[PDB]
Symmetry: D2
Subunit: 116 residues, 4 copies
């Protein structure tokens, strides 16, 4: 709902399936406190991580375990993960799609942020 | 060196070596006239394409033969090639680095335009 | 349906709306013959370009008028367009999503190719 | 120069200059220990981070302060920063170029690992 993570495999041209995603939120405090996690579906998407009420302002870290993904496909990738760190909901609730496009030695991440 | 092409391989994390690159200039009748070409070097770079005097304003196309590159590495590519089409100024040169980051199903191209 | 083009604006984190897209297919012949065109919707997506029956094997060119997009937002971008050229349906009908992520001096394009 | 950081600005088509970059090494207790830092140069590059002797195998994090960069250009950025986390070998060095292409709502990072 307010947070969705979508992962693509740039080598296959496919969704990156079964990609583990961990979302953390920066506490008071400055530590990363576990916020949510999940795997991408066969569409490469991970929905349902959170809700409007739970997904409050914060600095969030979305950690995408790209390494396991590549390693399950036989590839020794460069990165340990793709992590995306951002301030969310700074000027009100938004919907965040966190897109990652994965290659063994490269990724990109894109945030699509929309306003209900 | 007003125009330079740099090509990287996102799969191997390496320069993309021996990638054919063609550069075209749009002619008055809107056809692509060949202008220059080369193959990226060991460093994934292609210098010497043109010179300041020759590299006049116009619309140029850089075609990077990504498909043959992926073919040579045994990897099914999606694109026939990566084209970059751009107007060279206004206003003046300026050096252009056309950077391409290649994956089998994705590429990015970026223009680093300096001076 | 078998061809969809999705365009994102990496500067805003938004769909790239009202982006003109022209699809050509390479004729016999070697010329690019107009295949379909459209604009992206408010989701940055362009659906309905073609149909399974019309979208036969071919080399297709999807030309995304990124320049007009940027220029309507005040930006003199580097590229004239983003064009994506590919062989389609080489080993049978697939669904192609052609994604472009736009920045004034950079784009990426990603093909997500799936098999009904 | 075993580790080099190059940062490009996709909005301006330019090197991303004066971007702060921190490099951390994962310590035995899994904390990030600061290792090196610098600011990208006129050319969007940051050399001299480390040396062969110092740049042992391990897991390293390169944090690129993309937010301050975009802040300085008056452009709202999405990310707090671009982190690149990677294991430096096996098997051996190898030079690492960590290339980052920045846009306000997107970045890519690419490792060009040579020798």
């Amino acid at each position: 709902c307010p947070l969705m993570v979508k992962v693509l495999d740039a080598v296959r041209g496919s969704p990156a399936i079964n990609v583990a995603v961990h979302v953390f939120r920066k506490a008071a405090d400055d530590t990363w406190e576990p916020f949510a996690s999940g795997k991408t579906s066969e569409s490469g998407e991970l929905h349902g991580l959170t809700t409007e009420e739970e997904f409050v302002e914060g600095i969030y870290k979305v950690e995408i375990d790209t390494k396991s993904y590549w390693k399950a496909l036989g590839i020794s990738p460069f990165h340990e993960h793709a992590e995306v760190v951002f301030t969310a909901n700074d000027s009100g609730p938004r919907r965040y799609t966190i897109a990652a496009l994965l290659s063994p030695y490269s990724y990109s991440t894109t945030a699509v942020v929309t306003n209900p």
